[PDB]
Design a protein around this ligand. Sequence first.
Ligand SMILES: *Cc1cc2c(cc1C)N[C@]1(O)C(=O)NC(=O)N=C1N2C[C@H](O)[C@H](O)[C@H](O)COP(=O)(O)OP(=O)(O)OC[C@H]1O[C@@H](n2cnc3c(N)ncnc32)[C@H](O)[C@@H]1O
Ligand SMILES: *[C@@H]1O[C@H](CO)[C@@H](O[C@@H]2O[C@H](CO)[C@@H](O)[C@H](O)[C@H]2NC(C)=O)[C@H](O)[C@H]1NC(C)=O
Ligand SMILES: *[C@@H]1O[C@H](CO)[C@@H](O)[C@H](O)[C@H]1NC(C)=O
Length: 577
Amino acid sequence: AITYQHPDDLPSGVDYDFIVAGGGTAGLVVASRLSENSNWKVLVIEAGPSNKDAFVTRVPGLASTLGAGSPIDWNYTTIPQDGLDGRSLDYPRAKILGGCSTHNGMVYTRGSKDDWNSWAGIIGDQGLGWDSILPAIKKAEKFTQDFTDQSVKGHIDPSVHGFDGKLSVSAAYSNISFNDLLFETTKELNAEFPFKLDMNDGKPIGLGWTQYTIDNHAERSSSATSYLESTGDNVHVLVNTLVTRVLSASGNGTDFRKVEFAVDANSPKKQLEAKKEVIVAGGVIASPQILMNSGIGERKVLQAVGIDTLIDNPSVGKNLSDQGATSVMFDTTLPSTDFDVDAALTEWTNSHTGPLARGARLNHLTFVRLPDDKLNGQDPSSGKNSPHIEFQFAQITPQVPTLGVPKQAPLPAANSYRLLLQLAVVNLYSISRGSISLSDNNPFTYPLIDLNMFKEDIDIAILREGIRSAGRMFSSKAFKNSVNKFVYPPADATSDEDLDAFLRSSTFSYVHGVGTLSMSPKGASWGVVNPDFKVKGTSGLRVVDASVIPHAPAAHTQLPVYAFAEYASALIAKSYN
Ligand SMILES: *Cc1cc2c(cc1C)N[C@]1(O)C(=O)NC(=O)N=C1N2C[C@H](O)[C@H](O)[C@H](O)COP(=O)(O)OP(=O)(O)OC[C@H]1O[C@@H](n2cnc3c(N)ncnc32)[C@H](O)[C@@H]1O
Ligand SMILES: *[C@@H]1O[C@H](CO)[C@@H](O[C@@H]2O[C@H](CO)[C@@H](O)[C@H](O)[C@H]2NC(C)=O)[C@H](O)[C@H]1NC(C)=O
Ligand SMILES: *[C@@H]1O[C@H](CO)[C@@H](O)[C@H](O)[C@H]1NC(C)=O
């Protein structure tokens, strides 16, 4: 691809077959795949800068520095969340080529087979069901040895991995005692915490070694590095440029093959017309905003901010499915995972080794299925193979963290711990659906984000049980004297009431949002896109990104986005023969 820093740098007289709005995770898959046809020309318009020389984004262990408040973040926050003591939550999202694949924690999780089968059923397309989609996921994957060629025997099952694809996946790990204490806990508490060889086999329940989108040179593998980099000159990428609206090519029709864009709110709007289609790939937050600012949305909402409704679809921006999470911290006497970061960065720079080479400071995920009697409501999961709860072990540190700790969350008593074991406990199937709406009709104004956190009681109840589950893991015989009492929440906070009060102050968003432009069958009474990814009621316009995925999986969402984007790419290309 050729990257252009400003619209005036674009070459004159070029007509593009496809224009992709959002050079993110999905957007770069689509642009890169469609460009495989040498006769097609593809323009990507991306709000952020190029990922090139975005140095910190290359370093896997610096990922934790890239969320809310970072130089590359959108700095989205939510409306006050009345289920969380009125708190406004951050909603970290990357503003940069590759989108969230450039800034995320690199976790590679496919979700359970039930998730894919659930989506397949809702959408009415069995091509998205597990048996049908798994081969495509493998084809898209390039699992690799890490830079140091560490043995991952017994850490993954090569059976479920592709080795020849686009997106690099690896599983480098530190050699720490915690690893063995976790494994021995699986023998003690095997009913709740069995060992899981490969959580990407469709059945993720258990304790698994984490897999990451990290290449063979200990650099982040993003959609820019995996897909865009190898493309030819028929891909043009315009960065630092906001798509403001999509527009009718005919002017009174719903053939939304035109895009409008501008470099800032005080600059000239420019327009281009795609010969075939505009593919909106702005992600779960931005794609609904682009569509609403284009007149595609809930008429009353649009009217109230001065936008003429061209397509009245009240599902636009609705059904935001994400995951609520809290940190939990235990007193521990285990060795810290901390290190001198400057020193480690010099090491990564000089040798591509050291802790910054790895995707996290601990090496495992746990996926826990709660029994029916610890579900205070109907089971919200996709099926029997699906976990309700994730543990994402973060670090061991004598310093109380700010990451994963909301601003006014009470901190553990200094004297209550030696070191802290921090992990996130995530309610993977948080049923309370949120929304994206407009404050005004200016595309440069951020949209209103509601996560509707804890509207449904099952969501906080599941998280409470997730905390209790963590308590059981670190109560194992293996862990005795190594990992001791809870300190966040306090050890004395044991009741439903007391954990709920803790959760209102401690819960934040896991930012695995999907669903705001939901895919539904053609003729369904709700949703925004048909199974062909086309916006209902339009021509020349598709949405391909997390917004179409009907509900969040039991997983981190990058892989599902890549796999939807690959699925869309294939069918778009096919439609033009
Ligand atoms: C931000 C974030 C995401 C995630 C994690 C951590 C952080 C802080 N960690 C993860 O859990 C991880 O470890 N593993 C994962 O599987 N998932 C993680 N994760 C979420 C994941 O990255 C995310 O769901 C997925 O990447 C979403 O992809 P997609 O739907 O394609 O959205 P983006 O990648 O955000 O791309 C949108 C793209 O669009 C640009 N943009 C937005 N609005 C405009 C306009 N109007 N015009 C032009 N461009 C626009 C964005 O800047 C972006 O590049
Ligand atoms: C959010 O998604 C749900 C589907 O999961 C939609 O629920 C459907 O709503 C229609 C229209 O009222 C009903 O006919 C269906 O029976 C519902 N299906 C299910 C599974 O509940 C819902 O309409 C979506 N909401 C919005 C605003 O888009
Ligand atoms: C997000 O805030 C950070 C910290 O102030 C800043 O560096 C960055 O430019 C902000 N993002 C945007 C889109 O302005």
